[PDB]
Amino acid sequence: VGTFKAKDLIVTPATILKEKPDPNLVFGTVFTDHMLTVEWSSEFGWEKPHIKPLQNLSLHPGSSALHYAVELFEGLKAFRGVDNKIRLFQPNLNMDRMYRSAVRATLPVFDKEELLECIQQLVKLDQEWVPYSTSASLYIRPTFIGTEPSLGVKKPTKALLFVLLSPVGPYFNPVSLWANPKYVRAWKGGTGDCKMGGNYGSSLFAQCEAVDNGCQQVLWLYGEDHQITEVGTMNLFLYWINEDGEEELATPPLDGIILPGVTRRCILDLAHQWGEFKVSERYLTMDDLTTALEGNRVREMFGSGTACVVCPVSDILYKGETIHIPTMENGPKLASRILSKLTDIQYGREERDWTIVL
Amino acid sequence: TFKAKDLIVTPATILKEKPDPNNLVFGTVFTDHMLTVEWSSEFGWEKPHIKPLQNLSLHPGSSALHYAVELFEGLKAFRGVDNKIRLFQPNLNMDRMYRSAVRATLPVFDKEELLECIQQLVKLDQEWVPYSTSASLYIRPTFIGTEPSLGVKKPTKALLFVLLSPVGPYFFNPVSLWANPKYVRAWKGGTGDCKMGGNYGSSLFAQCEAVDNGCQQVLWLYGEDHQITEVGTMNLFLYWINEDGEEELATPPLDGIILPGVTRRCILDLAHQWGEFKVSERYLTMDDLTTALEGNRVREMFGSGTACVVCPVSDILYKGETIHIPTMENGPKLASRILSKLTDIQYGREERDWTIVL
Ligand SMILES: *Cc1c(COP(=O)(O)O)cnc(C)c1O
Ligand SMILES: *Cc1c(COP(=O)(O)O)cnc(C)c1O
Ligand SMILES: CC(C)CCC(=O)O
Ligand SMILES: CC(C)CCC(=O)O
Ligand SMILES: [Mg+2]
């Protein structure tokens, strides 16, 4: 057990540099000039990290990442502030999650501080890619795959940790959800609370069926009571008047089937800080939703995540019936306020312990 | 769809020497060649290639590394007692690979063309099909999404390849199982009924946990009543006297959480034709099992799968106790009869339409 170290970084600058794209971009379509890569073996442990020109990965055909999904990823952003200072948002939480995911994937552990510094060195080198727009940013995709060259299903004796950079804009423009309870995203005892690739490949069929019915995303339902868990790849928030006639900002609890998002945490922290209404991490079902609608109790519904931050939901297609959510007709007040707060913090218009600057 | 007729063959310059068919570690040795077929949304399938075993050059953003957009298959080639090389139920593998491709939203292919391409790959490396009646050539068709963009969606790029690995045993050597209801392999509304990469990477944590407890495999439990579903990566079979006091061979039903193994189907077929006892596809819980043991009603328990046609079970670690299974004390009579029959068919000692020559 050990870790690679940032002070050991081997930088190899690309001679040919690619022209930056126009800030006004399709998510994950464009990649920067460089990338970070770190090899690992159970025999020699972590090798020295490298920052080199973006290039293809040369992988053995038997690599466990291609056969048994031994893999995991992360997603954070770097923002060019109104002061032109590049900032990262709550990077330390992504490193924690990534570490936890590694352990649950049986991939080799590493030192969070070192990885973060290596990332900071990667972004710094390609800092000119960080968009020159207050509505765009640079997406950081840390990835960790098993490269064991054997078909035996088991803990990998070889692995590759790498990091890609992609300048992006959007991932309000409300979305419509497709809710089919026949499809299940995560289960108790599963890995839904980790960012392991295995939990995503199996959702593509559902996502396709969603676009097949005019929806932009999938509303993941769970259990006999059809609990509302997540919106596609985002955590779900419901701003309504609860059963007790109280103004409430609710979101499903972290009971195993919900991925603990960094945006989810922040929203809950801002929501608690303001102390203007009740904040509850509890169970929400379709019936709770419908009963509330046929009472004008609902105010806003939206998804949260690094890619969208705040993503208003306006309709849910459930049991052949299109269920409209008055999110947009009520502002969206909270959703907008939350967007401004996070955006202000991310672009340096507001000082806070949530961002770091190199 | 690609066509076998279009195969482009690039034979290796230097051929590796064959391993000892007596000391083979499952899936660690690979033959001289592999099959590769590139797919693109814009152009469709490229022509198929049989070229020397080399590393795959993939864009670091390939969806197979990020979102487990991948699936695999497993079938074997056997050198018969007449020295004729045979494939066992290969068309069933093609059908399962095809259905899984659809569920993963990977591109469809002509099942016969793939099989012919595989036969031609095996024909080229035919000398790798071990001169042994206790060894064979494992065939690993693999289908991965190579989509460069980081968006979670249906791939517009993909690769289909086939590797070959001479093998002997996956590990009668009875195995002990580690049963802990805290982990769930697959769930209703899930994808556990497909050979999609995502279902395995999530198992490693439980698997390594079984090892540090002396067990070679995990006994996958499901639900409040703790149904016993599969033995590691193999289907589960129970030979006992049931509640009604009847002699019976039972195996969990295909209700969505069980992978329809080819071996499993074959065993049910053989058991059905012998018609010497009741054959049931039914639920089985730890309680039925432990209650049956206390009643001395259990005879044999074993896992089945291409890697280990019949893998007898001797012990189960559950609730801190070690539940002994009398399988080996009972012969294992049925386990042997079945193993003997399947191998007699595979190695041509018996003719049946379950094997395809060359
Ligand atoms: C990444 C992800 C989220 C959001 O987490 P953030 O850290 O806020 O980006 C939510 N749900 C799923 C399933 C995710 O993969
Ligand atoms: C492949 C597999 C089996 C066995 O099926 P065969 O087609 O008979 O090899 C059983 N269970 C799981 C989970 C599998 O992946
Ligand atoms: C799953 C990732 C491609 C996007 C996560 C998000 O920010 O919602
Ligand atoms: C999962 C694979 C490595 C083995 C499947 C089997 O033969 O049971
Ligand atoms: Mg044809």
Which domains, from first to last, does chain A contain?
1-171+347-358 (3.30.470.10), 172-346 (3.20.10.10)
Q: What is the 3-state secondary structure (H, E, C) of A232-254?
A: CCEEEEEEEECCCCCEEEEECCC
Q: Name the phi and psi angles at B179, rounded to 5.
A: -105, 110
Residues 6+ apart with CB under 8 A from B223: none
Per-residue tokens: A81 = 């502030």
Pocket test for ligand 3, best of A171, A262, A310 (most atoms within 8 A of CB): A171
Cβ distance A190 to B184 less than 8 Å, yes or no, reads yes
Q: Which H or E run contains B308?
A: strand B308-318
Per-residue tokens: A347 = 């672009």
Pocket test for ligand 2, best of B264, B309, B339 (most atoms within 8 A of CB): B264
Pocket test for ligand 4, best of B72, B170, B196, B258 (most atoms within 8 A of CB): B170
Residue A296 to residue A310: CA distance in whole angstroms: 22
Residue B251 to residue B236: CA distance in whole angstroms: 6
Tell me the CB-side half-sphere exposure of residue B85, using CA atoms within 13 A: 19
Residue in B with minimal Cα distance to A193: B202
Cβ distance B60 to A57 less than 8 Å, yes or no, reads yes
Residue A21 to residue A239: CA distance in whole angstroms: 37
**DSSP string over B26-39:** TT----SEEEEEEE
β-pair partners for A218: A178
Residues with CB under 6 A from ligand 3: A 75, 233-234, 305-307; B 150, 152
Residues 6+ apart with CB under 8 A from A246: A277, A278
**DSSP string over B96-131:** HHHHHHHHHTPPP--HHHHHHHHHHHHHHTGGGS-S
Per-residue tokens: A227 = 């609990």
Contact between residue B63 and residue B53 where contact means Cβ atoms under 8 Å apart: no
Cβ distance B204 to A153 less than 8 Å, yes or no, reads yes
Residue B15: Cβ-neighbour burial (10 angstroms; 0-12, 13-18, 19+)? middle
Distance from Cα A74 to the centre of ligand 3, integer Å:
9
β-pair partners for A168: A137
Cβ distance B154 to A35 less than 8 Å, yes or no, reads no
Cis peptide before A260 (omega within 30 of 0): no
Alpha helices in chain B (DSSP H): 63-66, 90-104, 111-124, 198-201, 204-211, 262-274, 286-294, 333-346
Q: Which ligand is nearest to the CA of A268?
A: 1
- In total, the C-beta contacts within 8 angstroms joining chain A to chain B are 213
Q: CA quadruple A86, A87, A88, A92: dihedral positive or negative?
A: positive
DSSP 3-state assignment of A155? Answer: coil
Which of A34, A68, A104, A215 would you mutate first to test chain B, the one with the most B CBs within 10 A?
A68
**CA distance to partner chain A, nearest, from residue B69 (Å):** 5
DSSP 3-state assignment of B321? Answer: strand
Q: Distance of alpha carbon A163 from its chain centroid, rounded? A: 15
**DSSP string over A328-340:** GGGTTHHHHHHHH
Cβ distance B26 to A155 less than 8 Å, yes or no, reads no
Distance from Cα A266 to the centre of ligand 2, integer Å:
43
Residue B60 to residue A55: CA distance in whole angstroms: 7
Cis peptide before A149 (omega within 30 of 0): no
β-pair partners for A11: A51
Residue A281 to residue A269: CA distance in whole angstroms: 12
Q: Which H or E run contains A228?
A: strand A227-231
Per-residue tokens: A5 = 């170290």
Per-residue tokens: A300 = 């806003």
Any idea what the Cα angle at residue B232 is, between residues B227 and B233, rounded to 5°?
110
Residues of A in contact with B27 (CB under 8 A): 62, 150-152
Q: Report which protein residue has its CA nearest ligand 2's atom 12.
A: B233
Contact between residue A69 and residue B201 where contact means Cβ atoms under 8 Å apart: yes
Tell me which method was used to determine the 3D structure. Answer: X-ray
- Tokens 């930056």 -> residue: A20
Per-residue tokens: A199 = 């939990």
Residue in B with minimal Cα distance to A189: B183
**CA distance to partner chain B, nearest, from residue A218 (Å):** 12
- DSSP annotation of A255 reads S
Cβ distance B55 to A61 less than 8 Å, yes or no, reads yes
Residue B141 to residue B121: CA distance in whole angstroms: 11
Residues of B in contact with A207 (CB under 8 A): 152-154
Provide the 10 A C-beta neighbour count for residue A165. Answer: 25
Contact between residue B203 and residue B185 where contact means Cβ atoms under 8 Å apart: yes
Residue B88 to residue B347: CA distance in whole angstroms: 10
Q: Which H or E run contains A166?
A: strand A158-168
Q: Quote the radius of gyration of chain B (alpha carbons, Å).
A: 21
Q: Which ligand is nearest to the CA of B3?
A: 5
Residue in B with minimal Cα distance to A233: B152
Q: Is B143 on the interface with A (CB under 8 A)?
A: no
Q: Quote the radius of gyration of chain A (alpha carbons, Å).
A: 21
Resolution to 1 decimal, in Å? 2.1
Contact between residue A220 and residue A185 where contact means Cβ atoms under 8 Å apart: yes
**How many residues can be counted in chain A?**
358
User: Which ligand 4 atom is nearest residue A151's CA?
Assistant: 3
β-pair partners for B167: B136
Q: Is A92 on the interface with B (CB under 8 A)?
A: no
